[model samples]
Target: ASRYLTDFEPIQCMGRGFGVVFEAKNKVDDCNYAIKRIRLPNRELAREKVMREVKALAKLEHPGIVRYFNAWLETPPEKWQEEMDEPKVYLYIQMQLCRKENLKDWMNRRCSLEDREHGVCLHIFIQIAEAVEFLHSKGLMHRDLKPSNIFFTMDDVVKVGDFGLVTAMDQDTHTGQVTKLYMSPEQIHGNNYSHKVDIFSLGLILFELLYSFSTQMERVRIITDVRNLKFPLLFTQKYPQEHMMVQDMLSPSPTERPEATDIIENAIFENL
Candidate 1:
């Protein structure tokens, strides 16, 4: 029987992003999906913002990007806006249900020098780079790219998601947070930003994959230093090519970072 989201039955609470998420099973074929439901105050612009996500997700088909099944809106009565102090709108987005473990767990758990030295991190991240390239090709910017927002299928494919911060290049001030850790320096410093902020995020993400940390404090401290664009010798020595690429990507000047297209083109991604 249809219980949630019109056609699917809610199986379990998945987690939360900009909203509550559910793991639901579609009766059509018994496939499980990740469904996110967000509530917003009834307003014209907020509705416009979410529909942008709907339109973008509907057509973006990529293995490294999360699969978007469908989305729809449920609105309160038109009279409710006038009768109640806070009338609301609801958005339910259905997507592929990946495993509960996200990229953060994977990046932190693999503390092996073998993986770091063998360019295994790069191989895994190439999917994400290509995925971001796919998003960028459509004139969208995933301003919020982070570990938790990203998912990994048990099959070892990366699924970059969390589209709340995804927006067109023309800005209406979509500023909020990606928890400060992966945010670009320009965004943190309150300067005009570019799509390269996404590149900067990739640099930080790749940073986390390459380095291992003993303590949470040290981990945060190094990330802060990297934010200041200080290159650590330990990182630079072992992976000089990656070090060079990340250094450029983390440039305080947004334009200095290579575009996603450039990242996929680099010779460093060639052999390994």
Candidate 2:
């Protein structure tokens, strides 16, 4: 209940929803923050389920993860018109502020040698893998890890955000937690997915970052043709070792995918 406290007033039109971001004026003493307003869906069961899962991810602390500041419930003006005065569903969090640009957008344009070196593809992979590993360690999975969801600070540190659809690594799941573009094979089809699902996306992201994913629409076209997917020989020749890492991760069978820790320790750490 205390988890929902909104610092920003309703923007009416901004971001994906009506919620406005907190500005310097609205800043609480000793707290520089942003807030997201959430309404509990009509389905009580799903709402309760996702909230519990969020609590678990909130407990996850790492440099690569967006900090969980606080949450609370509030009622919007329209909802309050009725006889009953209900609080709004708002979540307020003070996170590390950084200049943000989506990797998809970044990749669309030419990247500089200096920035690329600092954003060192290998270092970026290591940090992202470690963060995902942390979530997996806690039995939680950030099903929505993607270029837009991944953020970088002014200091060049990467942080993973957006946990709305992230869920526990339960054996039974009907729908996917992540998006369609970054989805795993099981997620694409109707197969049961777990921690390995995240690995698939990670491998996919690795491929896109090293290679210019935006420029390679032909490759993506071939990839989308199949429900259950594997990389083409082009990947093997281009990336070599990175391609091997991706191949193991992208096996159509979830059970065949490599462990997240092994991906970091053996494939990523040594080579990168």
Candidate 3:
């Protein structure tokens, strides 16, 4: 029996890729929490790989950021007979659960609704921006931010998770694996980047929220357009304030972009 996983009863796989997350109910509390199981990519130095994310989750406690519960390091059973297919060490991360659809699905479903609640978009964006703001204040950057990383609770509140790429502010990082559609100009060139890249990605997420795309190809085209940062006429005319903000966020010069604080304190957010 795997001692690390024995305490929690797993419900279903929540998300899967390089790592897999599941909905598990804690035996003691009977409360559901999202459990992420990640096999170390680097075999020799596996523990250190996830400690960074674990450290971050432990330090960062905010309503917008995903809450950390507990974690464990386990040496998997040697079920495989072959040498190359041997078991690998896995790190299990237990955190707050957001069973609702991810950011992309949330936006897509909203687009289908008869009541086009524009205010709801503002509501969502504000929560994420504030969380990013809080993250910046901690002298850190969520280098990887995309639709799948963001989650929603039963009450439909935004909870930004996936801190696997979280690192120091102003740190020089390789433009590695995050989706290119969300990459800022500097990030696309594999140039030195900091927190502003996150802001630019945030801008892309806002665009997805404001504009509705029926097809995946359509979504890609709109994100790649980058003309006026791929903004629509309605976006500019109806949301003049946000138009300027989005334009600034997408600025090729990261220095010119407004910081998270500036975005949170904007006039457009006062009423919403």
Candidate 4:
């Protein structure tokens, strides 16, 4: 697996852990790409899950979604002695790079709440919704749809990244693994859920774009309260209409939430 691929030169360390990412460039084509190397676990199920993500990403080809180039599995180096533990396996995937930064990082650079909400806010929201809609159309549910996984290109285009938690709709099952602040009520209960979970998370992201939190504790408190169907009084008072939209998005019952397509169709996002 490493033979022909040795031409890639690592430009930066993108991440760490079982799956590590590197910003690399091909010596042949001189093209830059993000390489995700998954040092696969020993369990068969774990390996299958990583392969599933690879397959899912390969089938997806939308502007709002990250582009997939190639993937392969590399056998670990042979053991030196009979007594040594079995060698570890490795999986690698190469894809386009989104160097502009994720939404969470981008927000940190903004000077004020209003600065975050202007012309680009609604556009980015609509873009993310469109990406989710495309995935749903393909029968895929991106269980993890937090700001950290939503990336922006240098041109300011939104590209939803990280398909590790993605699953087919019919296979949807409960998992405790989730971003707590963005998790929907049904998701927290580990009930059978649908694409609405993404809508719920998107709503939280939109809320972050629209308003400012004074402190991390207050932000966590508000989101936790939202899990119980509570809303900050100030939020409702200042933007009743938008708050109503958020309420619909974060409805306790998944059936009450609007689909990604429906959200995109709303005239409220027309200006963006």
For residues 1-272, write the lDDT of model 2, one tens digit per residue.
23222333222222432233332223355434445445555456766755763586468799988766655555445554531322344444334444446455565564433344424777887888888888788787777667767777767788777677766755424464336567876776567778788888887777766754433566467446422445556555756778778778778877888877888887346543
Top candidate when judged by TM-score against the true structure = 3
Worst 10 residues of 1 by lDDT: 77-86
lDDT of 1 by residue, 1-272 (tens): 12353577778876676778878899788889888888764467767876767788887898888888888766655534532431656787888889788877766666656545556677778888999998888888888888888887768678887887678886415464436688777777666776888999899988787887656788889998887777678888987888888888888877778989898898877564
Error of 3 at 258 (Å): 0.4
Q: For model 3, how does the per-residue alpha-carbon lDDT over 1-272 read when each residue is reduced to its tens digit?
A: 67545788777766663677878898888889888888876655545755678889999989899889887877767623521431577788888888658887776776542444678888888999999999999988887788788888877678999988777754324444446578677766567777888899988877777777778887778778853466667667877877788888888888898899999898888674
Model 1 stretches with alpha carbons more than 4 Å out:
1-6, 75-86, 112-117, 170-178
Clashing pairs in 1: none
Name model 3 segments beyond 4 Å from true: 43-47, 79-87, 112-115, 170-178
Question: lDDT value for candidate 4?
Answer: 0.77
Give the C-alpha lDDT of model 2.
0.62
Error of 3 at 148 (Å): 2.0
Q: Relative to the true structure, how large is the alpha-carbon lDDT of every model?
A: 0.77, 0.62, 0.77, 0.77
Give candidate 4's TM-score. Answer: 0.88
Runs of candidate 2 with Cα error greater than 4 angstroms are 1-14, 17-26, 79-94, 111-119, 170-178, 215-219, 222-235, 267-272
CA shift of 62, model 4, Å = 0.8
Local accuracy of candidate 4 as per-residue lDDT tens digits, 92-162: 88889886468877766663666776457778878998999999999888888877888887677899988
Tell me the number of clashing residue pairs for each predicted model. Answer: 0, 11, 0, 0
- Deviation from native of the Cα of residue 189 in model 3, angstroms: 1.2
The better candidate by TM-score, 3 or 4, is 3
